[model samples]
Target: LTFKTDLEKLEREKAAQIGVAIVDPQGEIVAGHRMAQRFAMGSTFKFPLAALVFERIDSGTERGDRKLSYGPDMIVEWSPATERFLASGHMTVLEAAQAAVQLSDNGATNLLLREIGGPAAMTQYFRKIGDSVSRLDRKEPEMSDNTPGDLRDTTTPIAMARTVAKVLYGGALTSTSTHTIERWLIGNQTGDATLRAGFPKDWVVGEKTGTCANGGRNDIGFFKAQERDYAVAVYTTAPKLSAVERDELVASVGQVITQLILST
Candidate 1:
């Protein structure tokens, strides 16, 4: 079960402008903000994409080290310049996984999506994993008309955090799959900057973050406070703010949760 007193306090304090959902290691929602409302997942969807790949690996359908190719066409227009360099005709599954998680490479993730089974494949895999509230949004002109919308998959904060916890607690996936996903998540240090900024430097936090053109800042991850673990996810629709303002907003929401967790 989740306690809402702190969550309510944070909403009262302007710590959250949109929605928030936090869970414990045991898969319990600790705090929430309009958690039922659906929001675009952004790059955080890569975690599920990664999970799908691990599933194939566990099922003996694919090998993580197997080499493959996705050509320059895989690169989306709005992708970072770094991604352009990575776009190529050949790479290993492990390489693709690294780019997907570490760099949040849209092209790499899209390629992996195909490699693991494509949009429909991932959708089915997610359902089997018990995330019915989440669904993938196609990554082409149909959805956004620009950029790699592979991360366009959307879900409520509660569902997203629950999915993440499922992976973390070794429940929704096989043990081997869980191990691989954790390895990938722990190495994903690039996207969780805002959330990590509020926690102690020594603490280990494995999280996934999502973002898009319209201030679509969102993150879903777990913080290991020694013997305890806390899962958290938050999303906002603050398209009017600058980068600095967005960072502050992340801190605002993150700080409140940090205080709440520490106080507990």
Candidate 2:
């Protein structure tokens, strides 16, 4: 089957709403499937939130090493990695940023969110940078009431890939922030079984994974091939599938895109 047909088949078999998009090194959309459709973005918001926080550092409003305390109000369940820092009562802004993306730490995200001026501020940032299709209307697990799909956060596949491009290539952020963001993404531990599972042992795959209620699974990142580099964003909502099943489908999507890019 062709790549498009195969992806469609998988979406059907997995009982999912799927969106996929890939951009080549030349910034061309080499492949796409339902790429403009919106889905709940889960922890993927952390990626752009990192950018917003760095914008502060870039403007001299905050320093990377500035200390930000973790308070009871910012605490959230399921954040083992960040709970330690919360117990310690604080962490640096840079460390909080790193934890937000690398650990997908809910507490760290809330910490950064409050420091960066919350959801409304980030909504403006997305539009200011010309990313009109993405929205961050609420914090984690508190999705906006207006959004359909009962999903708290939302993003289109194409918009997410474009955000990845901004993070990687856009000069909107300082060199230091850009480099640090890349490092945090590459160092992310959450996607080992999803986006990272699709590539060869030594391939450089930098990505983030987002999981939400009702089996929502999303992975967005940059992959380097021997001949070219590409950015991929795959978003799926498959409540019928277990968490493992959802992750497997995401990895499969990554593998397909990786093979397609390598072949070309």
**Could you tally the backbone clashes for each prediction?**
0, 1
Give one digit per residue, the lDDT tens place, for model 2 in 125-229. 888777887888888656522244553368888888877777677676888888878778889989988978987766777888888776679988887776466
Q: In model 1, how many backbone clashes occur?
A: 0
Per-candidate Cα lDDT values, in order, are 0.69, 0.79
User: Per-residue lDDT for 209-257 in model 1, tens only?
Assistant: 6665656677777778778877777876566676666666666677777
Question: Local error of candidate 2 at 179, Å?
Answer: 1.9
Worst 10 residues of 2 by lDDT: 143-152
Alpha-carbon deviation at 82 in model 2, angstroms = 3.1
lDDT score of residue 111 within candidate 2: 78
Candidate 2: which stretches are off by over 4 Å?
A: 25-27, 144-152
* lDDT of model 2 at position 65: 92
Model 2 local distance difference test score: 0.79
Name the regions of candidate 1 deviating beyond 4 angstroms.
1-16, 78-88, 140-152, 174-176
